[PDB]
């Protein structure tokens, strides 16, 4: 049980970090998709 949950957390972290690298590469290759989503972020923050 606990060991299975720990392994699930580990593989979830691995998937999260590789997919975060996907964010990193797409943001590096296209800044426009970054500024507008930042604007959406601040819209959500103030809303």
């Amino acid at each position: 049980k606990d060991e299975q949950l720990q392994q699930r957390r580990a593989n979830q972290r691995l998937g999260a970090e590789v997919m975060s690298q996907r964010i990193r590469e797409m943001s590096d290759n296209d800044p426009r998709v970054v500024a507008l989503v930042i604007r959406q972020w601040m819209s959500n923050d103030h809303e």
Binding site: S20, I23, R32, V34, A35, I38, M42, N44
Partner: protein
């Protein structure tokens, strides 16, 4: 549930340090400080939360698709070779200031009218007139209403005289007034927080304080008492709100409060009730004997707290 700020905060950690610094440069220093405090205290993302913030960011990226760069220089460089760098700097600065001055206009419309008026009270009457013209007619009136008669009349007179419609200096004027807000802080100066503390204090203690401030300044004392005013008379609070209180507060507590209340207070708190309810309340008041004033004052304080909560909800006005 994760708040919109927390999702944005988690995304700010995830996007990397250099990108976070660039976003800090592109954004407001208050936002930079908020993000710094958030990443210092507790991380905002759990494994489900990180999944949610990353997924919603992905859906934002899918929708925000345009194959374009920010080009806060690259776009200018392509323009400069074709037409020359000069055929832009001035016009771009003017356009940005127009966006900046409209941003300031909207900000002034949103922020409190009397605060805007006192921020501009020291300023030039021509400044007041031109800013009133530029502002929304509701906002322009709101700043105008908070002035003295002479300054206000001069402002409307100069509204007509404002024919120069000046243009870079107006933007710089907005910049100058903008830089004074972050130092102003305040937001408690008004004789309202002290009024709440006076209400909070022990009955005889705020009575002595009221006498002392009457000695200090009768006008200030009267203003603070007007701020005090809470269901001490019928006209200020209105019969509908009197009805609202009685249907929202326990009858026993209301009667105990009415034990020490004035007979006009009893009359105003009995007119709203029907004949049966009024008769029951009057009979209970007559039958109930004397009670130590501490409990009566505590129940009155609880009732007034309920009244303040109702006013905060804003169903009806009091005063």
């Amino acid at each position: 549930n994760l708040s919109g700020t927390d999702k944005s905060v988690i995304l700010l950690m995830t996007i990397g340090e250099d990108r976070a610094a660039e976003v800090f440069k592109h954004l407001s220093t208050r936002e930079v400080q908020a993000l710094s405090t958030a990443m210092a205290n507790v991380r905002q993302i759990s494994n489900k939360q990180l999944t949610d913030v990353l997924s919603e960011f992905e859906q934002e990226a899918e929708q925000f698709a345009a194959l374009n760069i920010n080009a806060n220089e690259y776009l200018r460089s392509v323009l400069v070779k074709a037409l020359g760098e000069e055929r832009a700097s001035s016009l771009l600065e003017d356009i940005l200031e127009t966006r900046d001055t409209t941003s300031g206009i909207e900000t002034l419309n949103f922020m409190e009218p009397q605060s805007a008026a006192d921020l501009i009270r020291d300023e030039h009457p021509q400044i007041i007139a031109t800013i009133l013209v530029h502002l929304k007619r509701s906002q322009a009136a709101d700043i105008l209403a908070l002035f003295d008669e002479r300054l206000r009349h001069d402002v409307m007179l100069r509204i007509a005289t404002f024919g120069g419609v000046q243009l870079a200096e107006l933007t710089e004027v907005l910049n100058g007034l903008l830089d004074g807000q972050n130092l102003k802080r305040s937001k408690m100066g008004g004789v309202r927080t002290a009024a709440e503390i006076i209400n909070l204090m022990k009955t005889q203690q705020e009575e002595a304080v009221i006498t002392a401030v009457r000695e200090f300044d009768g006008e200030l004392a009267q203003k603070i008492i007007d701020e005090m005013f809470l269901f001490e008379n019928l006209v200020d609070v209105d019969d509908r709100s009197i009805q609202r209180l009685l249907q929202e507060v326990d009858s026993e507590s209301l009667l105990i409060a009415l034990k020490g209340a004035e007979p006009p207070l009893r009359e105003k708190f009995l007119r709203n009730m029907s004949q049966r309810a009024a008769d029951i309340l009057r009979d209970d008041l007559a039958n109930r004997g004397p009670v130590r004033l501490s409990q009566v004052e505590n129940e009155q304080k609880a009732i007034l707290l309920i009244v303040r909560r109702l006013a905060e909800t804003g169903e009806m006005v009091i005063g």
